[PDB]
Structure formats: structure tokens, C-alpha cells
């Protein structure tokens, strides 16, 4: 919708702010606001420049954020290499090759949850050894041979609708002391209904977990 509304729709807009760790140096980041969480509209999903990881920050009500300012810059909504190769891999497990500075190539098994909002050329991906929300343009790792999609028992798109969604829930965990790992489920992956986006307090990372309460 081109015409604006009194509420400021700050989703899909390049922003810029100062980050201050308590009694530390002030850093300057810019990035793209990807989404806003409906079960807590204070939270926005942000992708910083040069950073593959997606972060969840309560930008207006946070104290660590300084000089929040919206750039006149526009996100490059653009070309989709193939509408079919992307999503032929969504919901499938993959092995993503990453190489260290030494040159020693490694592999990380993970699953492609969805397609990124705002930057459509990017894919939502989470890894097993590191279960958080990352953003990579996989359409490139495949062409260069750094991404392998492997055969698995994944039927992809009661037969009738079930009330299954756990969005809006409240979670707590067995932290060894260290306060308590409290949080809230904020999203359900539309390709894998068992996989959920969780957002804990005292943390700005979007965790991608699989909730079934029993294997």
C-alpha cells in the first residue's frame, strides 16, 4: 500500500542506530527490518549488513538501542533466480559448506524453513549444532556446489484442520542456576508445523526449535 497510515509501519525499511553494551563502546549498525511479531508488537526482526544472522530486538522500548533513525534507502526487491529451485529445497534437510580462514572446509547439517520476507532472494535456514535464525542466499551455494540437499521422509505440499499451533505460549527450562530460560513462542514454520520460532528474554537471537515434548 503506497499511502501511509498514522501508525508507523517500519517493516521493510532500512534503519540505522547506535548499539551500546553497558559501559562499552558505541557501535553503529544499519540494516533491514524484516518483520514484526504480532504476539508482542514491540519486537521487530532485523537483518544487519554483513551479518547472516537474524536478530530480534524491541527497538523502541530497548535501552541498548540509540538514535534509531530510518534511512531513505530502499531495499533492492529483485530477481528470483528460480521460483521452483527455491522451495524444492524448503522443508528439506541440507548440508551447507562453510570454510574457515585457514582454508579447512567444514559442513553444517540444517533445514530450510522458509523464504525470507522483504529480501526474497534470501532463505530462512537453521542449523542443528547452532539452532538460531540465519539468512543466506542459498541460490548461490548450490550453483557453486557448497549446498547439498538430501532424500528424506518429508511429505511436502486427521486430514481436517487441527488446533496445533503453539504460538503465544510461555516457556521455561532447566538452566543450571543462571536465572531461568524463560521465553515465548512467536511463530510456526509453514513447511514444518513442528518447528517454532522462540524468543527468550535477555537474548536477541531467534531460536528455531522443534517442539513435540517427546522426540
Amino acid at each position: 500500500s503506497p499511502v501511509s497510515q498514522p501508525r508507523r509501519n517500519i517493516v521493510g525499511c532500512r534503519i540505522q542506530h547506535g548499539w551500546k553494551e553497558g559501559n562499552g563502546p558505541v557501535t553503529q549498525w544499519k540494516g533491514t527490518v524484516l518483520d514484526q511479531v504480532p504476539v508482542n508488537p514491540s519486537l521487530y526482526l532485523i537483518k544487519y549488513d554483513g551479518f547472516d544472522c537474524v536478530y530480534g530486538l524491541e527497538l523502541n522500548k530497548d535501552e541498548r538501542v540509540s538514535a534509531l533513525e530510518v534511512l531513505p534507502d530502499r531495499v533492492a526487491t529483485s530477481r528470483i533466480s528460480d521460483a521452483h529451485l527455491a522451495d524444492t529445497m524448503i522443508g528439506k534437510a541440507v548440508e551447507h559448506m562453510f570454510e574457515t580462514e585457514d582454508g579447512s572446509k567444514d559442513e553444517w547439517r540444517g533445514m530450510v524453513l522458509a523464504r525470507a520476507p522483504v529480501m526474497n532472494t534470501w532463505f530462512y535456514i537453521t542449523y542443528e549444532k547452532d539452532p538460531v535464525l540465519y539468512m543466506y542466499q542459498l541460490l548461490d551455494d548450490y550453483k557453486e556446489g557448497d549446498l547439498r540437499i538430501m532424500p528424506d521422509s518429508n511429505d511436502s505440499p486427521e486430514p481436517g484442520e487441527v488446533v496445533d499451533s503453539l504460538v503465544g505460549k510461555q516457556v521455561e527450562y532447566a538452566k543450571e542456576d543462571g536465572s531461568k530460560r524463560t521465553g515465548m513462542v512467536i511463530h510456526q514454520v509453514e513447511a514444518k508445523p513442528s518447528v517454532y520460532f522462540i524468543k527468550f528474554d535477555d537474548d536477541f537471537h531467534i531460536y528455531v526449535y522443534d517442539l513435540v515434548k517427546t522426540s
Binding site: 551479518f51 547472516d52 562453510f98 551455494d141
Partner: peptide, 13 residues
């Protein structure tokens, strides 16, 4: 060819 250094924000914390 991707790099884990890039992946997360270099300033940690």
C-alpha cells in the same frame, strides 16, 4: 565459500 566469521555480528554482547 561462506564464512562463519561473517555469520553473526562481530561485536559479541
Amino acid at each position: 565459500a561462506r564464512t562463519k566469521q561473517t555469520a553473526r555480528k562481530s561485536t559479541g554482547g
